[PDB]
Design a protein around this ligand. Structure first.
Ligand SMILES: Nc1ncnc2c1ncn2[C@@H]1O[C@H](COP(=O)(O)OP(=O)(O)OP(O)(O)=S)[C@@H](O)[C@H]1O
Ligand SMILES: Nc1ncnc2c1ncn2[C@@H]1O[C@H](COP(=O)(O)OP(=O)(O)OP(O)(O)=S)[C@@H](O)[C@H]1O
Ligand SMILES: Nc1ncnc2c1ncn2[C@@H]1O[C@H](COP(=O)(O)OP(=O)(O)OP(O)(O)=S)[C@@H](O)[C@H]1O
Ligand SMILES: Nc1ncnc2c1ncn2[C@@H]1O[C@H](COP(=O)(O)OP(=O)(O)OP(O)(O)=S)[C@@H](O)[C@H]1O
Ligand SMILES: [Mg+2]
Ligand SMILES: [Mg+2]
Ligand SMILES: [Mg+2]
Ligand SMILES: [Mg+2]
Lengths: 737, 737
């Protein structure tokens, strides 16, 4: 429902494309049963429509040699118009265009090779006799008096719109033909298909941008105001600017583009005028989209800035933003990677209010990007992109761009024998055969460019219950605390209770407190934000406490979300202990957390979870009803669960059939799940000491586990086990003395 | 494979040089079996190619008197063209150049001595009869009507390109002949051979700079984008600017050079124009390289800078950087020693993204520099440069330059008798004989200029296992933790384990924890970054915590790397102890380390190692699985290892045959390896008390060791030995209470 703009199917006038024989591109197909639906008439022009604007306007009709539900058409219309198969041509005629002084007439490429003379006469002139030219600017097709093809372009403008011309007219061949490059920048020009990884954010942009522009009567009918303020933001390199020029190409609205730096590089008293000129050009031209790219360049905080020409431009922009009446039909967009450095006044109601967040893409989204990049490359058969896309984490769209680049250049090194640098233009017997293998993507993925931007990430964890041995009651217990209130709202208001929003895990180390949290976030299919305690205490050597307020906020957009504060013992030991230097646990971040924890509605779909293995030093305030009032003690695994731990840890290993698991599980008593996973890691570490020596077979054996069990060491003491059972019994008391 | 651009061999047209008799340099050699490969024709011109551009274009062919695979040629072509032997002349003809108004005609040196008149007529005129002048500007050769040689230069330009001229023409002798200096600045001009110590960084510069320029079709073919943003950085004096003018001389691309200060010294509103003029001059001239030297002069952070003419130039540069379309074929380079003071916006994708790091050279690299400097000097026979290059550590390329200088000037002092300062031009009987001895390099290497830039260094240690007595299991044990995952990736994914990334050494003082780490970094041949704890705590009196984030980053470029945090006890005692003032160990840097330690992939090739001799105060958080979960206790040496310690410590000493080692080893019980090394140092301290007295023989004797053993003192207590065996047994428990 949030994607509902992607919906496009079932338009009667909407149909696919297929073969033509006719290499004079004047023609356009028909269909006999389709005209039955249509108004179509003999002669002049159709408006056929397609991807990314530009279209073809020329003579039409007679066909049906090829069958129908598909459209005949001249395969040059594929280099023009769309990319290729499967999409739609959209046709209605636009008849009887005006008769002018004739139009255009200039070549591009192959006319310069060979004998020219007066050109258009030499080759093309016989082609128009009483046919005369329904035409549009931008058509490039093959025509000759000769070897049977050369392409051709357009120059002159008598009117701006397209014509059906007459003779007696004056035209000119007097120009110079041209090179390719002007064509590629038409074909490389970006559409909605070059962006990948953001579906959810495009659905919000067309609802905000496109829909009010084309259909202003809608909001006018239900009586609602369109926002004029869209503000895009995200980390560097995430494709913000890219979504700009996509929407530039995809609109029927005049598009003006302001570069923040380009405004500031100007002289004083002048750059004040460039803005005033940009808001005047749009308002004149009916609907329009102004886009101010890199906004925080021109508008930082009036409280920290120096020059008076810097403070005007910010007060200049405010005075234009309020000069927008709905009558004008103008939408102002903007893009910034530092949304918190923007002047606060710009983000208030009536200026920039709607926000759209372009985030770091996840493993699905970054696969979609890798495919948009490499679709021009030639790849080997050993290339598994679903394998690559899994191995790149901190990478945003611009890193995958520089990843595909460092792999191609690694392939050019294996070829450095057959390339010379002393030669002028090298042979093409390598130029064709040079392809990119997976052995390269392993090399690029290990290099510098893997250095990438990495900060708070919000995603569904990949760990399911199947990764967790034992603990079957808490799995049951958690599902109630999280699923049912989010899944079944009817049950709770009925019986009159309000759900509780928070949970505290406690127990000995290594018993799975982290796994339980990531697991339930995957079952509810909610988002997961994880902040380890040592990260709370680090940032304040630079002294920024807004980063805690920023995390609760960030989880609010991501609702439904579980917000998991891990290793709370590290914060309560930030003083060293209860006796310690003599502080309590509450200081620093904890007072800022208990505050922000209370600003969240009990109806909220965000759900907080703590964890600590030091229940003695957690301060009384965290445990209050309304904060984390659900306490759950996770014990060491018993003997029957140690069976279940060992099994799940080995699901990725080539264990032998003869290894007897429940033999281990009952000889290991004070071990936690961290200890058993450590046994398995050494067992495989003794299997490799064979494997390399066995060279100078490969399935881990029953002897190795025997060997590992010797050194194995119990991580939880005999006194610890007891003491946890003291807090396991009553930690409610705690607070109050 | 990363060096693959150095590859140059097997070009058919590529061959060496050898003797000619012919002192009229118009000629150029041939070969009879080589022309069989060639197209070579009789008369006019060849393009012969060589080192650092400039070449010779003149008559060619007839030879074979001298044998082939070598080339005859006139030894003046050696002062021109290359330096000397062993390199290549590269030849193809460029026939039939145009017939002009004649060209040049002006002398340099020896014509001013003697009788001139009208010059060119007096001596050189008979030399051209129906031979007429295939020629190029820059040839300097011997010609006379007279004593049989004087050299000669070029002045006029009728066309820019070179000519085969005719008579009836008008030329002029009307200029004034000239001094040498204009020639030396041609010969001292810097090539790729003046730089030394960076091979790995040049391979990256030609892949980034040269290859896209000469061969833009390559990246166009495999469909990849060349970077326009190369940014060089490093400490002062490391030869950044030097790599600039090398690439200046070595390119066929127009080279423009911006000096940062020279931009800023200009008036306001003007220096804005000098940049705009510099990006316009390049774009006009096809491929081109703009180099902005000392970048951080013009572009510091827009958040800390004052004047508005300082903020324009930064927004001026941003607006030019984005005005670069690939069509332009321009690469913008830059150089800075303060990469973290550059405005953040310049380093984002699409502006300056590729980085190349010119580091402090190591002992090999600085030997290569010393040889590039002293190759003009006359050296004595006592000079061992491999000995000098070992003794200079904090020295970068510009210190070795000022080292070779302070040694030459020390040699001029021993000569101060035969030099007078009251004389005008001193005698040359010293001017020839003055040479540089090793007794000087000892003096220079002890002086001020040894004061040098010294900070974090990344290198393979010079200590191998042979330096370490005993500890044979940990040597085995370490190799698995480090080598096999880096050497044999096949074994680990097979059995399904992920390797663990970190190790914690603990034990009593002086037992070799430092040696074990440096040793395994040498065996894997990986890089070694060492940060002693007291260095973590010092910088924050200036309050900079980015230096911890900067160390993990720095180890990431250096992968494979071992990152060794030494003396962690000093950090955990930064409060004084557990009871202490009442803190825990975690504060300060430790919370910033545990954070940065987690941002490193388990697939990473960087490997972290800690060490502490105070296992009681290390905080629980370091030991968590995923951080340092491998604990290894290094015990005091037993009796059989104390034998092995004493032997390795003495490998550099003239021990007598009669000294009985295992006698010592069993009378020393509570001693650690630090204690035994201390015995050996006093034993040699008692040998020198003889040696000087023995003057008023030299091999250390068996008596001395007897004498030292008396005072020897046990550094580890009797209660310490026990207590370590308590933590040696269970330190896993630790965390959790
Ligand atoms: N989601 C995406 N899908 C496809 N390509 C992408 C995506 N994101 C980035 N790219 C590519 O990588 C480059 C990233 O540049 P942009 O996204 O335009 O810069 P940005 O996201 O505005 O970040 P800045 O400019 O540093 S604040 C673009 O040239 C794209 O070709
Ligand atoms: N019940 C369990 N089932 C499966 N694996 C477990 C279990 N308990 C612990 N482990 C293993 O122990 C490791 C750490 O588990 P966590 O969930 O991080 O434990 P924790 O409660 O966070 O305690 P620490 O101190 O952070 S190790 C994981 O790699 C798991 O494979
Ligand atoms: N790697 C090297 N090989 C040979 N000579 C070097 C090397 N590095 C420095 N030198 C010499 O020492 C001088 C160092 O100056 P540069 O390297 O040009 O300055 P820099 O490295 O840009 O440092 P700055 O200017 O203080 S940021 C040069 O004149 C070189 O002659
Ligand atoms: N096993 C050993 N073999 C050879 N030399 C040793 C050994 N143990 C200690 N030493 C000597 O002791 C000195 C210091 O050794 P380190 O490796 O620094 O010991 P450590 O574990 O760092 O303890 P400290 O407190 O730093 S001395 C070196 O000069 C070594 O020569
Ligand atoms: Mg941008
Ligand atoms: Mg954990
Ligand atoms: Mg410099
Ligand atoms: Mg040491």
């Amino acid at each position: 429902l949030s994607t509902a703009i992607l919906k496009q199917k079932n338009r009667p006038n909407r149909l696919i494309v297929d073969e033509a024989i006719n290499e004079d591109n004047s023609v356009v197909s028909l269909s006999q049963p389709k005209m039955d639906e249509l108004q179509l008439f003999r002669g002049d022009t159709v408006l056929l429509k397609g991807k990314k604007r530009r279209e073809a306007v020329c003579i039409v009709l007679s066909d049906d040699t090829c069958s129908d539900e598909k459209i005949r058409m001249n395969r040059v219309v594929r280099n023009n118009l769309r990319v290729r198969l499967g999409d739609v041509i959209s046709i209605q005629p636009c008849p009887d265009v005006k008769y002018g002084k004739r139009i255009h007439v200039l070549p591009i490429d192959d006319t310069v090779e060979g004998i020219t003379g007066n050109l258009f006469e030499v080759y093309l002139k016989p082609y128009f006799l009483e046919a005369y030219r329904p035409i549009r600017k931008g058509d490039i097709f093959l025509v000759r008096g000769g070897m049977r093809a050369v392409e051709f372009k357009v120059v002159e403008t008598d009117p701006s719109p397209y014509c059906i011309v007459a003779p007696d007219t004056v035209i000119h061949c007097e120009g110079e033909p041209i090179k390719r490059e002007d064509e590629e920048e038409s074909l490389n020009e970006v559409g909605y298909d070059d962006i990948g990884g953001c579906r959810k954010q495009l659905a919000q942009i067309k609802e905000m941008v496109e829909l009010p522009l084309r259909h202003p009567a809608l909001f006018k009918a239900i009586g609602v105001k369109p926002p004029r303020g869209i503000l895009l933001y995200g980390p560097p390199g995430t494709g913000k600017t890219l979504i700009a020029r996509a929407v530039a190409n995809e609109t029927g609205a005049f598009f003006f583009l302001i570069n923040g730096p380009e405004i500031m590089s100007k002289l004083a008293g002048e750059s004040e005028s460039n803005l005033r000129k940009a808001f005047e050009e749009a308002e004149k031209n009916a609907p329009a989209i102004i886009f101010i790219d890199e906004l925080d360049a021109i508008a930082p905080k009036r409280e920290k800035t120096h020059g008076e020409v810097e403070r005007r431009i910010v007060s200049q922009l405010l005075t234009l933003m309020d000069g927008l009446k709905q009558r004008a039909h103008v939408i102002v967009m903007a893009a910034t990677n530092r949304p918190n450095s923007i002047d606060p006044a710009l983000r208030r109601f009536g200026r920039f209010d709607r926000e759209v967040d372009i985030g770091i893409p996840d493993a699905t989204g970054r696969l979609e990007i890798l495919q948009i990049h490499t679709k021009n490359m030639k790849l080997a058969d050993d290339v598994d992109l679903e394998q690559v896309a899994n191995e790149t984490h901190g990478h945003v769209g611009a890193d995958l761009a520089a990843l595909c680049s460092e792999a191609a250049l690694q392939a050019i090194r294996k070829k450095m024998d057959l390339i010379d640098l002393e030669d002028e233009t090298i042979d093409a017997e390598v130029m064709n055969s040079l392809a990119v293998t997976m052995d390269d993507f392993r090399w690029a993925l290990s290099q510098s460019n893997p250095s990438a931007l990495r900060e708070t990430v919000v995603e569904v964890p990949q760990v399911t219950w199947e990764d967790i041995g034992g603990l079957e009651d808490v799995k049951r217990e958690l599902q109630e605390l999280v699923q049912y209130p989010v899944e079944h709202p009817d049950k709770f208001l009925k019986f009159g209770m309000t759900p509780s929003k928070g949970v505290l895990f406690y127990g000995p180390p290594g018993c799975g407190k982290t796994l339980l949290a990531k697991a339930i976030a995957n079952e509810c299919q909610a988002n997961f934000i994880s902040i380890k305690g040592p990260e709370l205490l680090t940032m304040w050597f630079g002294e920024s406490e807004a980063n805690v307020r920023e995390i609760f906020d960030k989880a609010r957009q991501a609702a439904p979300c579980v917000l998991f504060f891990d290793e709370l013992d590290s914060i309560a030991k930030a003083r060293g202990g209860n006796i310690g230097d003599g502080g309590g646990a509450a200081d620093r971040v904890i007072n800022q957390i208990l505050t922000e924890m209370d600003g969240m509605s009990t109806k909220k779909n965000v759900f907080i979870i703590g964890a600590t293995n030091r229940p003695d030093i957690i301060d009384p305030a965290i445990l209050r009803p309304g904060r984390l009032d659900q306490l759950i003690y996770i014990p060491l695994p018993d003997e029957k669960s140690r069976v279940a731990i060992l099994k799940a840890n080995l699901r990725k290993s080539p264990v032998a059939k003869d290894v007897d698991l429940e033999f281990l599980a009952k000889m290991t008593n004070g071990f936690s799940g961290a200890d058993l996973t450590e046994i398995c890691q050494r067992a495989c570490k003794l299997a490799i000491r064979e494997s390399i020596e066995s060279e100078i077979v490969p399935e881990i054996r029953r002897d190795h586990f025997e060997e590992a069990m010797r050194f194995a060491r119990r991580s939880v003491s005999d006194n610890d086990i007891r003491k946890y059972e003291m807090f396991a019994q009553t930690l409610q008391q705690s607070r109050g003395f």
